Structures are given as C-alpha cells and as structure tokens.
C-alpha cells in the first residue's frame, strides 16, 4: 500500500500537496531542518525523486532499546551500585541537578509518570510515534518498562523510598520514540531530536538571542540521552543531530549490544557520545559494542521500572544515563556558578573548558592506559567533573 520516507527539499521549490497528489501523506514537517516525513504508495517514489524542491528521498530506518532484564528490594531507599561507581552522592550538597535553567530529555518507550519516585521530576511528556506529537499522557506512558529504567538512572529521587538517580533533582523531559515492544523508526527518533529542542512551547530560541541550551528564557533541554540504536546512518538524522550540538545540547547515546568492532547509531556520530557497558568488577561486558567515547555501569542496573516498581536491566542503555546524569551535574553546577553552560566539545577534547574535555580527563581510565576500544576513555565520574568544571 504505502512506505514512510523522509525527503530532504529545498524550500523554496517545494510543495507538498503535490505529494498528496500522488496519493502520498504529510507526515511530519520538521520545524529545524529541510525535510519533511510522507508516506507516499511505492509506485510514486519515482515521482517523489522528481518532483521539484525535493532533493533526497530516504527510506525509514529502525532502531531498538538497548536494554533487556538481567535476571527486587527493600522498601527503604537503596542506592543502585552504578550510582556510587560514577561518584555522585558526593556532588549533591553542590548540585542535585536542581538547576532551573536544566533538563535531560530521554528519548525512549515513554515514562511511568505517576511513579512515586520520579513523579516530581517529570517535567514534560510527548510522544512522537508514528509521527503524529501527542502530549496526551496515555500516549506518553511507558507500556514498555525501559524508558522509566532509563529516567530512573538519571533522576529518581533522592528521598526514603526506591532507588535515586546520578542526578535526582534535575527535570526530565521524557520524549516516546520507541513502541511497547522497544522498537522505534528513524522518523519518529528525528521528531522526538527536534521536540527536546523545541521544548514544551514548541518554538526553539523564543527571545530570538540565538541561545538555546542554556537560556533560561527557553525550555530546550541541555541533554539528549539515547538509550537506542540503528545500523544506518540517514543525513536528515544526522541534520537534527547536528542541530542539537549547535543548539549547545550535549547527545549522549548506547553504542549498541553486539560486541560489534563500533558503535551504532546515532552513537557513532561524531557529536554523540557513544557509552559502553562496565559490570560490577570493572570488567567491559563482552556484549558491549567498542570503540565507545566512555564507559558506565550497565550490568546488574537497579532502577524504577512500571507500574511503581524497580527492575534489574542490563545493556549499554544502562550506561547511557549515568553518562546523561553527570552531564545534567556538569552544566547545572557550571551554570550555577557563573549562569551559563559549557561548550558540548568534541570527541577527542581533552581538556577542561568543555563537557566532553572534562568528562574524558576526569574519567576513570581503566584496562590500557587511555583511550582504549573496549573503555573509551574510562568510567565517568560526576564528584571529579564538577571539581574540574567549577576550578
Ligand atoms: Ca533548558
Ligand atoms: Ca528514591
Ligand atoms: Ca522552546
Ligand atoms: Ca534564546
Ligand atoms: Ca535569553
Ligand atoms: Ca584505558
């Protein structure tokens, strides 16, 4: 009947009832790049191609979770092992993430929004599948489990109940890109990118002063975390990538489970930071995929899980937000002594004037000495990156 591309177009030329002229759909226009989401029946790809103003056609990719179960307890607050390996209770009479200027967007299955230990951090709910952006909280719900695991890495409360979070007063904007089943298309992954920068206003830099992370007069969030990952790599995808970084967003994502020679996508990118998997004993899991930026626990993760419940996960997925969760530290404890954020960085930065420099500097360097392909640059560490960050 009819297939999901996305078509990278010019403008100007473009017009897209001439879409719904072939019989073709508009799914999504993007508001940040050249592109816009239409199905269109197979027979008229070739029109698509032609048409004026269109100058890509690509085909939607999918990607899935990077978490499954691993195989539970008490009813006082237990602080989940990866939480005191990454050093964060420390970091909390500085900050919590409690910032205002600051929120993490976790693009994953949904959120359990009412759960009593991530309730009051959840900040904002949308849901972008199938390419239709809902904020109805039925459709935002997690019917998956993941993403409330994910949330609660990063942000569950520090109170007397459940887990607590690498950063458990920062606010979340939880973006649902995968379905009940963890998988989620190209498509629905790019329109949630764009949403955790539009931000619950919808509009990205509304005082129009070119700030957008950062800026308290914007809702943008300063972290884009992806517990997810694809094979291909599409060049709208990556366009939206690339307006995150330029917007000061820092993208953090899993490098995948497959023990594969790199990671997968979006990790892969150059603007991303890519996260493999450490378990209890400082060992690399052997399903985490190499070549990682940096390396976080990822074996045996405690964390909420629906319906007000906890859950032991493992995978890079679970890496992926104790990365997210020190960042949120490092741009809410910079921000809050000198009122604005720092620079995202680059891949190889190695110094302390941007948030991938200080996350790489001050991580834990374990096996080879540097950089390796099983570690990256080594285990992060929030208490040692908020001490770079503020000296
Ligand atoms: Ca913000
Ligand atoms: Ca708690
Ligand atoms: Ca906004
Ligand atoms: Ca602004
Ligand atoms: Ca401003
Ligand atoms: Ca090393």
């Given at each position: 009947?009819?297939?999901?591309?996305?078509?990278?177009?010019?403008?100007?030329?473009?017009?897209?009832?001439?879409?719904?002229?072939?019989?073709?759909?508009?799914?999504?226009?993007?508001?940040?790049?050249?592109?816009?989401v239409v199905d269109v029946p197979a027979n008229?790809?070739?029109?698509?191609?032609?048409?004026?103003?269109?100058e890509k056609v690509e085909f939607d990719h999918q990607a899935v979770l990077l978490g499954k179960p691993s195989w539970s307890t008490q009813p006082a607050q237990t602080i989940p092992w990866g939480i005191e390996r990454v050093k964060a209770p420390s970091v909390w009479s500085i900050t919590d993430g409690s910032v205002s200027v600051i929120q993490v967007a976790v693009l994953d299955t949904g959120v359990d929004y009412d759960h009593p230990d991530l309730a009051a951090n959840i900040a904002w709910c949308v849901s972008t599948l199938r390419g239709k952006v809902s904020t109805?909280?039925?459709?935002?719900?997690?019917?998956?489990?993941?993403?409330?695991?994910?949330?609660?890495?990063?942000?569950?409360?520090?109170?007397?109940?459940?887990?607590?979070?690498?950063?458990?007063?920062?606010?979340?904007?939880?973006?649902?890109?995968?379905?009940?089943?963890?998988?989620?298309?190209?498509?629905?992954?790019?329109?949630?990118?764009?949403?955790?920068?539009?931000?619950?206003?919808?509009?990205?830099?509304?005082?129009?002063?070119?700030?957008?992370?950062?800026?308290?007069?914007?809702?943008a969030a300063e972290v884009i975390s992806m517990s997810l990952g694809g094979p291909a790599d599409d060049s709208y995808l990556?366009?939206?990538?690339?307006?995150?970084?330029?917007?000061?967003?820092?993208?953090?994502?899993?490098?995948?489970?497959?023990?594969?020679?790199?990671?997968?996508?979006?990790?892969?990118?150059?603007?991303?930071?890519?996260?493999?998997?450490?378990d209890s004993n400082d060992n690399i899991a052997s399903f985490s995929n190499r070549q990682?930026?940096?390396?976080?626990?990822?074996?045996?993760?405690?964390?909420?899980?629906?319906?007000?419940?906890?859950?032991?996960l493992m995978?890079?997925?679970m890496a992926?937000?104790?990365?997210?969760?020190?960042?949120?530290?490092?741009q809410a404890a910079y921000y809050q002594k000198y009122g604005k954020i720092l620079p995202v960085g680059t891949f190889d930065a190695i110094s302390k004037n941007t948030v991938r420099g200080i996350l790489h500097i001050t991580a834990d360097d374990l096996g080879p000495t540097?950089?390796?392909?099983?570690?990256?640059y080594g285990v992060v560490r929030a208490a040692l990156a908020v001490q770079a960050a503020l000296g």
């Open positions: 009947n009819t297939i999901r591309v996305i078509v990278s177009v010019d403008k100007a030329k473009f017009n897209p009832h001439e879409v719904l002229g072939i019989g073709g759909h508009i799914v999504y226009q993007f508001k940040l790049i050249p592109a816009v008229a790809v070739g029109k698509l191609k032609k048409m004026p103003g269109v109805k909280l039925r459709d935002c719900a997690d019917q998956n489990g993941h993403g409330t695991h994910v949330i609660g890495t990063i942000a569950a409360l520090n109170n007397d109940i459940g887990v607590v979070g690498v950063a458990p007063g920062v606010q979340i904007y939880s973006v649902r890109v995968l379905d009940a089943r963890g998988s989620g298309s190209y498509s629905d992954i790019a329109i949630g990118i764009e949403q955790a920068i539009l931000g619950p206003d919808g509009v990205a830099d509304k005082d129009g002063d070119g700030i957008i992370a950062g800026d308290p007069d914007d809702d990556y366009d939206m990538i690339i307006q995150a970084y330029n917007a000061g967003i820092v993208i953090v994502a899993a490098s995948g489970n497959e023990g594969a020679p790199s990671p997968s996508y979006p990790a892969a990118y150059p603007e991303v930071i890519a996260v493999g998997a450490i990682p930026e940096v390396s976080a626990p990822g074996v045996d993760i405690l964390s909420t899980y629906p319906d007000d419940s906890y859950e032991t995978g890079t997925a992926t937000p104790h990365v997210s969760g020190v960042v949120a530290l490092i540097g950089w390796d392909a099983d570690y990256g």
